[PDB]
Amino acid sequence: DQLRQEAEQLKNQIRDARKACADATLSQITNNIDPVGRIQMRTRRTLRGHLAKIYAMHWGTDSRLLVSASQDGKLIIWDSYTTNKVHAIPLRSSWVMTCAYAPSGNYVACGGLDNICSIYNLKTREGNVRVSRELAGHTGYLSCCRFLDDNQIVTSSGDTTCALWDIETGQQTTTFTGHTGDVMSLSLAPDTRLFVSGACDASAKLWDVREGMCRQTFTGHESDINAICFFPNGNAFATGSDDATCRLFDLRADQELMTYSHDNIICGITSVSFSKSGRLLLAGYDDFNCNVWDALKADRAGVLAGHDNRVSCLGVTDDGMAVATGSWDSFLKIWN
Amino acid sequence: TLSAEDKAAVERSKMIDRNLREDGEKAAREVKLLLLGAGESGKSTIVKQMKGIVETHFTFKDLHFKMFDVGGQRSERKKWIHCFEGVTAIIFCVALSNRMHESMKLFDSICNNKWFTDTSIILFLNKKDLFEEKIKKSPLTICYPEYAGSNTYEEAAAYIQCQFEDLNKRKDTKEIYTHFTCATDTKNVQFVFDAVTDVIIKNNLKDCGLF
């Protein structure tokens, strides 16, 4: 064999060089750093009004406005400081699994299992929220949708592909391929120039927005991936999976840095998020509790117990003044 | 201490809460039925007969039914079935015409899920105009050596039906509702209505403790 042999010997020698040049693990370097202690977070406020499971939730850029996607087909924009419902957008499809909040704050988006996170415009001269564009072209169910700008959105679906769109035209500028299983999560970099995507094929991979090529791929996993997020400097990311483990990779060293698992944990992870300073890692499990993981020590520094069902979506403010956690019990909770 | 504006914000929030409650109350009066089955198993024929993801809405005897067909998803990774909790039931379809073994495997998969323990399942064998003509070519032994019953329509059909029923690994919670009457007549609609009615009554009773 020549193509099989070439592929095998390549993969082998790249991985061997990566292992050899590896110096130490993240925990090995931060041993002299002390734990953060018990991160006791009380529910300062609770958002009520959803009448079904919560699948997704995204913070605004001003750190005061929320948006949450729910199984009942309602996208609600909250005012966190007062628990006011600023907007109530009736979605066309009741099967929603992800969304985002435009950085400018002008736009919010989605659809659902119809393979679209359709876009809504907030600041309209009619005073209501209207559907601006519907980005069609994906074939599999839709796993994420994140804004690069007010006129550029990147999307991840179950077709093993991610697409970069031009909202005004509505045509997918570029389409990304390489996955073999359903793509479940993507995270946009701070500079909106790169992003990482995770898929059911047990492999996360970094995809560039401009060239359209696959800059990198990540492996070292057992089961499918459900959640992914960048370290706040955009120089790393963490993953979450049904294996009941969360993994932190570095897109430069190409090697998995740390593992986030404990024996008592037997169920998967549905969402992941980071602290403003990237010192606390937040993951929403199926065990009805959300664990606060010290990203450098991997110990459980706290638990956001108080959810009566699966914790599906997390979030953090841009200023880090709070944490929003969603679950299937239809209640969002802002913690601090 | 509220300003003249924050009070109007609170009034907006209260109005939105009123709208949310009045729409959720409507959303809780609708029967949700997940539809499953293999290719050419009457799924399309059933959705036509019955009064990305595809939704079909119909009203029968004052009930609002939502039947969700998820046959478009070409990935076999069960990453959205858990979103179908709370559905009143399921409608799994199979055709007498080794397709039968694949259908049995899928039926076992749907019954054995942790997500559908409390949800009845409605197995359908609706068509009865082509289910007898082909029985005479060979008995139920092309891939099923065990069967040694009479090579007649009723006997073989009942044997297949009982073999499907036996797949239920826990009969305590759920129940399988079966149908064999011809698809031509408008009985397939009535059967699902009786099944959902029974499931609704049992859900109500199990809430009090009577069950």
Epitope: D79, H87, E126 | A4, E5, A8, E11, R12, M15
Partner: single-chain antibody
Framework: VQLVESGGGLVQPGGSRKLSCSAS????????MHWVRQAPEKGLEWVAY????????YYADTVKGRFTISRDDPKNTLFLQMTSLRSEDTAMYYC??????????????WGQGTTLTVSSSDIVMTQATSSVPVTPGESVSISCRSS???????????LYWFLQRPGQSPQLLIY???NLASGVPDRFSGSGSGTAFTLTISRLEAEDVGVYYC?????????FGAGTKLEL
């Protein structure tokens, strides 16, 4: 967005009429309505208010209990029924829309007004002057003072800036402080602190001539200023 009123004219003292305001071009049901009036070449004066859904109704101390504000969401129309008119009730009545939610501009749009003629505690804001000659390109600064401090505990200084051009109804420029509205050139700006407030304009143009009004929304009833003019 089009707010058009009607129902004005002439009326003797002690008579009754009904003003009407027809709104079209936006979600009227989600918008609360204000009523404002302006006496002949004297200035503005707030009148009434009805919140979204008819949940709250206020009135001006001048006409509280005499007058009424009515809503009809299905027909997208607004009413102001007037019971008994004194000789002071001559003025040009405006129809103003308002929606309150975090970040909103609650006085974005004004109507074209209507005229009514009759035969012959509260926060007080005073405007420094009523006329100021200036030429284009030479910066100006309009200002007015207030009795109380409009800075609420929310951190919001509920002071607005409307500019009434000759022969045209007022127009929002600033809705809390420096928060430029929709369709307004970026040259305008607003600033102040507690009681002293100023509106600044750089590189003035031919369309900046008119009367400037500063309105307060911290507590009801709302109160306008005398009105500062720019001479050209």
């Amino acid at each position: 967005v089009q707010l058009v009123e009607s129902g004005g004219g002439l009326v003797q003292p002690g008579g009754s009429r009904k003003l009407s305001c027809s709104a079209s071009g936006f979600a009227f049901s989600s918008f609360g309505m204000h009523w404002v009036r302006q006496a002949p070449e004297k200035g503005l004066e707030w009148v009434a208010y009805i919140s979204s859904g008819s949940g709250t109704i206020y009135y001006a101390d001048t006409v509280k209990g005499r007058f009424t504000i009515s809503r009809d969401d299905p027909k997208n129309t607004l009413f102001l029924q007037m019971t008994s008119l004194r000789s002071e009730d001559t003025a040009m009545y405006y129809c103003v829309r308002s929606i309150y939610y975090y970040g909103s501009s609650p006085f974005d749009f004004w109507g074209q007004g209507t005229t009514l003629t009759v035969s012959s505690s509260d926060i007080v804001m005073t405007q420094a002057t009523s006329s100021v000659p200036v030429t284009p390109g030479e910066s100006v600064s309009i200002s007015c003072r207030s009795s109380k401090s409009l800075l609420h505990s929310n951190g919001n200084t509920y002071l607005y800036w409307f500019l009434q051009r000759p022969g045209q109804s007022p127009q929002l420029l600033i809705y809390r402080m420096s928060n430029l509205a929709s369709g307004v050139p970026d040259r305008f700006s607003g600033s102040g602190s507690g009681t002293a407030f100023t509106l600044t304009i750089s590189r003035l143009e031919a369309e900046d001539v008119g009367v400037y009004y500063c309105m307060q929304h911290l507590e009801y009833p709302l109160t306008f200023g005398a009105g500062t003019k720019l001479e050209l």
